[PDB]
Design an enzyme around this catalytic site. Structure first.
Site, PDB file in Angstrom:
ATOM      1  N   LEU A 183       0.769  -1.236   0.000  1.00 15.10           N
ATOM      2  CA  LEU A 183       0.000   0.000   0.000  1.00 15.10           C
ATOM      3  C   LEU A 183       0.813   1.306   0.000  1.00 15.10           C
ATOM      4  O   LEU A 183       0.376   2.322   0.541  1.00 15.10           O
ATOM      5  CB  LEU A 183      -0.966  -0.020   1.183  1.00 15.10           C
ATOM      6  N   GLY A 241       7.818   4.652   1.338  1.00 14.16           N
ATOM      7  CA  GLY A 241       8.044   5.726   2.276  1.00 14.16           C
ATOM      8  C   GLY A 241       9.531   5.936   2.387  1.00 14.16           C
ATOM      9  O   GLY A 241      10.281   5.551   1.497  1.00 14.16           O
ATOM     10  N   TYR A 268      10.770   6.269   5.986  1.00 11.70           N
ATOM     11  CA  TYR A 268      10.963   5.777   7.340  1.00 11.70           C
ATOM     12  C   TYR A 268       9.936   4.716   7.719  1.00 11.70           C
ATOM     13  O   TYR A 268       9.934   4.219   8.841  1.00 11.70           O
ATOM     14  CB  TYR A 268      10.933   6.929   8.349  1.00 11.70           C
ATOM     15  N   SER A 269       9.053   4.378   6.786  1.00 11.15           N
ATOM     16  CA  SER A 269       8.063   3.334   7.019  1.00 11.15           C
ATOM     17  C   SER A 269       7.364   2.926   5.725  1.00 11.15           C
ATOM     18  O   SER A 269       7.052   3.766   4.878  1.00 11.15           O
ATOM     19  CB  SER A 269       7.021   3.766   8.069  1.00 11.15           C
ATOM     20  N   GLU A 270       7.143   1.624   5.566  1.00 11.52           N
ATOM     21  CA  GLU A 270       6.472   1.113   4.389  1.00 11.52           C
ATOM     22  C   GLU A 270       5.193   0.402   4.762  1.00 11.52           C
ATOM     23  O   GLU A 270       5.141  -0.414   5.686  1.00 11.52           O
ATOM     24  CB  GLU A 270       7.418   0.229   3.596  1.00 11.52           C
ATOM     25  N   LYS A 305       2.218  -1.038   8.683  1.00  8.51           N
ATOM     26  CA  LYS A 305       3.225  -0.009   8.535  1.00  8.51           C
ATOM     27  C   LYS A 305       4.463  -0.671   9.131  1.00  8.51           C
ATOM     28  O   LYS A 305       4.384  -1.344  10.163  1.00  8.51           O
ATOM     29  CB  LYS A 305       2.793   1.218   9.357  1.00  8.51           C
ATOM     30  N   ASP A 308      -0.072  17.472  11.562  1.00  8.00           N
ATOM     31  CA  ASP A 308       0.101  16.951  10.204  1.00  8.00           C
ATOM     32  C   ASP A 308      -1.234  16.571   9.576  1.00  8.00           C
ATOM     33  O   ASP A 308      -1.373  15.567   8.876  1.00  8.00           O
ATOM     34  CB  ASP A 308       1.061  15.754  10.211  1.00  8.00           C
TER      35      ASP A 308
HETATM   36  N1  LIG Z   1      -5.084   2.426   8.283  1.00  9.59           N
HETATM   37  C1  LIG Z   1      -4.843   2.605   6.984  1.00  9.59           C
HETATM   38  N2  LIG Z   1      -5.796   2.109   6.061  1.00  9.59           N
HETATM   39  C2  LIG Z   1      -5.607   2.254   4.659  1.00  9.59           C
HETATM   40  N3  LIG Z   1      -4.507   2.857   4.110  1.00  9.59           N
HETATM   41  C3  LIG Z   1      -3.556   3.328   5.037  1.00  9.59           C
HETATM   42  C4  LIG Z   1      -3.666   3.226   6.461  1.00  9.59           C
HETATM   43  N4  LIG Z   1      -2.662   3.758   7.128  1.00  9.59           N
HETATM   44  C5  LIG Z   1      -1.908   4.174   6.168  1.00  9.59           C
HETATM   45  N5  LIG Z   1      -2.337   4.005   4.846  1.00  9.59           N
HETATM   46  C6  LIG Z   1      -1.566   4.426   3.582  1.00  9.59           C
HETATM   47  O1  LIG Z   1      -0.279   4.841   3.876  1.00  9.59           O
HETATM   48  C7  LIG Z   1      -0.089   6.280   3.714  1.00  9.59           C
HETATM   49  C8  LIG Z   1       0.649   6.701   4.938  1.00  9.59           C
HETATM   50  O2  LIG Z   1       2.060   6.385   5.009  1.00  9.59           O
HETATM   51  P1  LIG Z   1       3.105   7.194   5.898  1.00  9.59           P
HETATM   52  O3  LIG Z   1       3.801   6.297   6.829  1.00  9.59           O
HETATM   53  O4  LIG Z   1       2.424   8.272   6.536  1.00  9.59           O
HETATM   54  O5  LIG Z   1       3.856   8.078   4.868  1.00  9.59           O
HETATM   55  P2  LIG Z   1       4.406   9.326   4.258  1.00  9.59           P
HETATM   56  O6  LIG Z   1       5.104   9.029   3.035  1.00  9.59           O
HETATM   57  O7  LIG Z   1       5.288  10.157   5.142  1.00  9.59           O
HETATM   58  N6  LIG Z   1       3.015   9.880   3.631  1.00  9.59           N
HETATM   59  P3  LIG Z   1       2.390  10.324   2.242  1.00  9.59           P
HETATM   60  O8  LIG Z   1       2.342  11.745   1.926  1.00  9.59           O
HETATM   61  O9  LIG Z   1       0.901   9.861   2.368  1.00  9.59           O
HETATM   62  O10 LIG Z   1       2.980   9.516   1.176  1.00  9.59           O
HETATM   63  C9  LIG Z   1      -1.497   6.891   3.560  1.00  9.59           C
HETATM   64  O11 LIG Z   1      -1.396   8.164   2.830  1.00  9.59           O
HETATM   65  C10 LIG Z   1      -2.231   5.681   2.936  1.00  9.59           C
HETATM   66  O12 LIG Z   1      -2.321   5.553   1.510  1.00  9.59           O
END
Ligand SMILES: Nc1ncnc2c1ncn2[C@@H]1O[C@H](COP(=O)(O)OP(=O)(O)NP(=O)(O)O)[C@@H](O)[C@H]1O
Ligand SMILES: [Zn+2]
Ligand SMILES: [Zn+2]
EC number: 2.7.11.1
Lengths: 200, 335, 204, 336
Positions: D44, D47, D49-51, D67, D155
């Site tokens: 899904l 990232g 720092y997290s995937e 995550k 955020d």
């Molecule tokens: N509980 C959830 N249910 C469905 N999709 C989710 C959920 N949690 C996270 N996601 C997906 O993961 C993304 C969040 O990843 P995150 O660790 O925040 O990354 P980031 O790269 O810093 N964010 P971004 O701007 O969204 O790419 C969201 O924008 C969603 O597409």
């Protein structure tokens, strides 16, 4: 006169290995946690980036060569971490389109190109193998050359990962299957066959 | 001129008055079934012209058996199908299930009914007087019948008789060797298992008849009641007619060939010798005397005789005193 | 006594790729009752089969069809169909199986078969339609030969059913199924049904 | 001369009167679950720092999400678990499923409930007045709750709000940025996405409160009803507070910093200028007037104001006239 990486990724069995551009190696943000693994972390990693030796010093622990080991040993754990990277994948996958990796032994996979992999992420507990995106099972490497590459250096999940990123690249199931025939027709459940390990 | 003709006492002209088709299998056509109809399972036994497994007609899951005829001539293959078919539906005459073939190898494959044939190691190891008499009778029934249809087996032997002792059911097998009896016809004497061959075969007399089946039979009974598998145990092909002579005697033998002036390959000349005709009382160890009866012996002696014309026939054997006890319980012989 | 140039068989059963082949003692080849039906296949049946039993040439004759060598082929060619028929034989098996106890045939590629020794086989009983393969009594599937050497041996010379047959005769010898299976793991755990994964061949 | 200290007008002392444990995650211990408990599925998104993947709890076959926190400090990882736990069970506050780790890599992995997001970029364009009002309300519910527990998100943005339009279910995400509000506490102003940052952040005023979440929200709504993603579209970090000024006006701005005597990095000095405070009626193209209502506008204007103390708060936003229609049916809860 030419890079260490392109040198080590040009020796026997190191055909599976892809050259890990240093953009990622220099970024010490990646090398994280390694230091508490490989011995002489520094001295080694220098050798790998092609810096400068430490040359008139002693050699009781035969350090002058014990580091060679660490260099290669270490470059492994990196190469593993690397091929993970969304980019390291492109490199690997580059070698796949031309299977520098090898094909599937099964005959019904029809010369299906495979990707390296490791049964264990621990050095010595296993060597490299070969996941087949078609049969989805593993096979020990063909030629006796690729027989001393630690599986750990390719990551237990690398292959699976690769398709998470590239689902389109996941092959189709075998067109047909092997059909056993004697004198003219199939052999129904040989369940009994087995039953003879009691009197054997 | 040389060897003297001979002929068949009973059913002497069955085939004669029957159609060209009934006997000319050479010009016979097969109506094959479907290979896929049944699949293999476990291997039963080996032959020389075929291998036998136990399969199953997937179209119902019924334990079937499959003989796979190894490459031979279209001959020996047809003269086992035609025969088999004319007899099937016969008494104790193993039912011919079906014929198929390896779609690619074009390989032949026969199919028959299943039979929980108790192996002999058990059979001739726990049978009692009656059992034998009983079974020996059921066999004749077959021989009589195939003889009725004018056919001889040429390969009778323990190996070829399926016995369902539990179900007192019994069937004959391997009709690959059986052929048709035609007056004055010479056949090949390289038939039957060694230990079960007849004299006509041991002396290249190529014009024998159903009577041949009888000899081979007598042999079985001997080995049985006497408990000597087989009773005529020879090394080569010549040492067979040798062992045989060390029992019925040498005399009646020579007198035989004489009665038929036959070219006796001079080899025997120094192998037979001079032998008395042992009185069967010589093969009655403590361990078999309970199978040994006077009618038994008598009956036997009436098969084991060099001249093929002198051996009892189907119907005849069947009316001997050995069988009385058995056939009596046949409340309706023919019904 | 001292010279063991052995037949032509001990010769041909000692070349590259002919490691799988077992020497077919002649007791069975002389008995022409077996060679049956072959003659209507191989060309120059006789001239060939003699070369095979080590008889004597036909030496001053011509060679337009270059028969002097065209036979060489039939020789090997033919010895194949025989070796096939042979290995089936209740005895030919013991020989094959002799080579199995020491895997002159090779082992199973799969890692979970744990170096399981295999027996040759043919996907087709027809010359050229395929080559030899390698049935594994464990996995129960076939694999293409390892080294490039055993790569020009016709499967037909080993019999589609040889292996299957071998175990009808020796069910005792049929290995146990894999102790364990391959478990795919990424970062820590299994990969539930990727059924979806596949779905991407419409946009690829 | 030393910047003017303010305070979170509301919930100003929640954390205070709460236990040392509730806020000191640094000394928080984790009760891990079982990795084997669930296995992966789709990926899904990546990232840095997290995937995130989509998995499934084998122990029932329920679509879960995963995550995988990439190596950071035990800090940022704990101040996302502790936070997450205290909030879970909250209204629209994404339920924290569980915590595991790579048995060998010792790698961390978060687990949450599943949510069928119809990514904003493709969903929003198809929402109607209610939808927005509706959703904007559910969000507040969250904020209110987390503020209740004395926590700010830092955020908030379309990117962080999972919307199951089919299931009208909605959850907030990315609690990595959220922190605790303590009276007189200076925090880092390098938070939030550019386009959604608040003025206190664009003018290095490090003593802000929950009110920050409100600005970022106001932004969302603007972009939404007006249909301009985002509404405050700037290049650098300074061109943001610039665009912002080309709308609420320049005056109220200066008056702000004055109200708080703040060191305004003289850079702005030549970048802002002099601007009237546009009447929102300027952003009503023919293509958005159907989302544009007077209460809508009114409600908005009550968040988008330089002073963080003037912004409506959770509960307050929640009682505005924009929401009435929605607030009604919600009450028609259980009562039906
Ligand atoms: N509980 C959830 N249910 C469905 N999709 C989710 C959920 N949690 C996270 N996601 C997906 O993961 C993304 C969040 O990843 P995150 O660790 O925040 O990354 P980031 O790269 O810093 N964010 P971004 O701007 O969204 O790419 C969201 O924008 C969603 O597409
Ligand atoms: Zn495969
Ligand atoms: Zn296997």
């Amino acid at each position: 006169e030419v890079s260490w990486i392109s040198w080590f990724c040009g020796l026997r069995g190191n055909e599976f290995f892809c050259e890990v551009d240093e953009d990622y190696i220099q970024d010490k943000f990646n090398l994280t946690g390694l230091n508490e693994q490989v011995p002489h972390y520094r001295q080694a990693l220098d050798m790998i980036l092609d810096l400068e030796p430490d040359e008139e010093l002693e050699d009781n622990p035969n350090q002058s060569d014990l580091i060679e080991q660490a260099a290669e040993m270490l470059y492994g754990l990196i190469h593993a971490r690397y091929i993970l990277t969304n980019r390291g994948i492109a490199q690997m996958l580059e070698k796949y389109q031309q299977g520098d990796f090898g094909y599937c032994p099964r005959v019904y996979c029809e010369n299906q190109p495979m990707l390296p992999i490791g049964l264990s992420d621990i050095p010595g507990e296993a060597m490299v193998k070969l996941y087949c995106p078609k049969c989805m099972d593993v096979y020990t490497p063909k030629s006796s050359r690729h027989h001393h590459t630690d599986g750990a250096y390719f990551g237990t999940g690398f292959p699976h990962m690769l398709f998470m990123v590239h689902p389109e690249y996941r092959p189709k199931r075998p067109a047909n299957q092997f059909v056993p025939r004697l004198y003219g027709f199939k052999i129904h459940p040989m369940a009994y066959q087995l039953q003879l390990q009691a009197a054997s | 001129s040389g060897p003297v003709p001979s002929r068949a006492r009973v059913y002497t002209d069955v085939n004669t008055h029957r159609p060209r088709e009934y006997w000319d299998y050479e010009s016979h056509v097969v109506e094959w079934g479907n290979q896929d109809d049944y699949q293999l399972v476990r291997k039963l036994g080996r032959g020389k012209y075929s291998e036998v497994f136990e399969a199953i007609n997937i179209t119902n899951n019924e334990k079937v058996v499959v003989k796979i005829l190894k490459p031979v001539k279209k001959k020996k293959i047809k003269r086992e199908i035609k025969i088999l078919e004319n007899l099937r539906g016969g008494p104790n005459i193993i039912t011919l299930a079906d014929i198929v073939k390896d779609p690619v190898s074009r390989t032949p494959a026969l199919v028959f009914e299943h039979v929980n044939n108790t192996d002999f190691k058990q059979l001739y190891q726990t049978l009692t007087d009656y059992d034998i008499r009983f079974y020996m009778y059921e066999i004749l029934k077959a021989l009589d019948y195939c003889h009725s249809m004018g056919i001889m087996h040429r390969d009778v032997k323990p190996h070829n008789v399926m016995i369902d002792h539990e179900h007192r059911k019994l069937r004959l097998i391997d009709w690959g060797l059986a052929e048709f009896y035609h007056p004055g016809q010479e056949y090949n004497v390289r038939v039957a298992s060694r230990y079960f061959k007849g004299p006509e075969l041991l002396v290249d007399y190529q014009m024998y008849d159903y009577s041949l089946d009888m000899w081979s039979l007598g042999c079985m009974l001997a080995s049985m009641i006497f408990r000597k598998e087989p009773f005529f145990h020879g090394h080569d092909n010549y040492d067979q007619l040798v062992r045989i002579a060390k029992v019925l005697g040498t005399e009646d033998l020579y007198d035989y060939i004489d009665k038929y002036n036959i070219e006796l390959d001079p080899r025997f000349n120094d192998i037979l010798g001079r032998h008395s005709r042992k009185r069967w009382e010589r093969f009655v160890h403590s361990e078999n005397q309970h199978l040994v009866s006077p009618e038994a012996l008598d009956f036997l002696d009436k098969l084991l005789r060099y001249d093929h014309q002198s051996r009892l026939t189907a119907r005849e054997a069947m009316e001997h005193p050995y069988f009385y006890t058995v056939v009596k319980d046949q409340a309706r012989m023919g019904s």
